[PDB]
Amino acid sequence: MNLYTVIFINILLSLTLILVAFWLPQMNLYSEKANPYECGFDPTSSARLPFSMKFFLVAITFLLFDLEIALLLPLPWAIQTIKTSTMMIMAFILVTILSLGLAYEWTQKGLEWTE
């Protein structure tokens, strides 16, 4: 209840700040005021156009690695087990497999950016 209360207090504080920031100062807006910024000239094309991504393979690898992190995260409770040999072997296997995948991608130039 207390955490929910303080989250709501933060929400109310930030909403109050942005509300007073939008309703306190004098408004004077026209077309050139609200045109988008392109260092003084008109934009040649819209910014909603496709914008090429040179680290897409690294992003997919980040998805897989983040799930490897999710697998590795119950370790502070796993170290309390009776059969610590099995836990230690399984954790070693998991981290070694993750490292081998990273090494294979590094060898196959997947970490390098395209073009």
Partner 1 sequence: KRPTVRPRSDVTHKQLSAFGEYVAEILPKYVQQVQVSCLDELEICIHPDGVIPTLTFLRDHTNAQFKSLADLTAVDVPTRQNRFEIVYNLLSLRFNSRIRVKTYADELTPIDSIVSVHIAANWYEREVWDMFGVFFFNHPDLRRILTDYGFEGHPFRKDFPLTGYVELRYDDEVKRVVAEPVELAQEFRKFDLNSPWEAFPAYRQPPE
Partner 2 sequence: MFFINILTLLVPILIAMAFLTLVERKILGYMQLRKGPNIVGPYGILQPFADAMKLFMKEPMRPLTTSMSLFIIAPTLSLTLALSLWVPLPMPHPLINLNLGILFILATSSLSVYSILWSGWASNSKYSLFGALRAVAQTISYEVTMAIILLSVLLMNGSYSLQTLITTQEHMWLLLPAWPMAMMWFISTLAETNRAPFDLTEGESELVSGFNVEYAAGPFALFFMAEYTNIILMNALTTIIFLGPLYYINLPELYSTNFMMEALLLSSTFLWIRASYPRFRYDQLMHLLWKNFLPLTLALCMWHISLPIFTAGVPPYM
Partner 3 sequence: RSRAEYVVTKLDDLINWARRSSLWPMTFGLACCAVEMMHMAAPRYDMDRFGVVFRASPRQADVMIVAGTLTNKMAPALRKVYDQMPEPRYVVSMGSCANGGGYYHYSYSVVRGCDRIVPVDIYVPGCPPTAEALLYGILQLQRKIKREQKLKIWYRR
First-last CA distance in the chain: 52
The answer to whether 97 contacts partner 2 (rule: CB under 8 A) is: no
Q: State how far the Cα of 111 lies from the Cα of 56, in Å rounded to an integer.
A: 10
Distance CA 40, CA 42 (A): 7
Verify binding: residue 29, ligand PC1, rule CB under 6 A.
Answer: no
- Asked if 32 and 41 count as a contact pair (C-beta separation under 8 A), the reply is no
Cα–Cα–Cα angle for 44, 50, 52, nearest 5°?
Answer: 110
Residue 31 vs 107, nearer CB to ligand 3PE:
107
Options 4, 23, 30, 41; binder of ligand PC1; rule CB under 6 A = 23
Tell me which residue of 38, 50, 72, 61 sits closest to 113, measured CA to CA: 61
Please report whether residue 99 would count as binding partner 2 according to CB under 8 A.
yes
- Does position 80 interact with partner 2 (CB under 8 A)? The reply is yes
Q: Which does 32 bind (CB under 5 to 8 A by kind): ligand 3PE, partner 3, partner 2, none?
A: partner 3
| Residue 83 in tokens | 């059969």
Q: Considering the rule CB under 8 A, would residue 30 count as an interface residue with partner 1?
A: yes
The nearer residue to partner 3, 27 or 63, going by C-beta atoms, is 27
Contacts with partner 3, residue ranges (CB under 8 A)? 25-28, 30, 32-33, 35, 37, 39-41
Contacts with ligand PC1, residue ranges (CB under 6 A)? 23-27
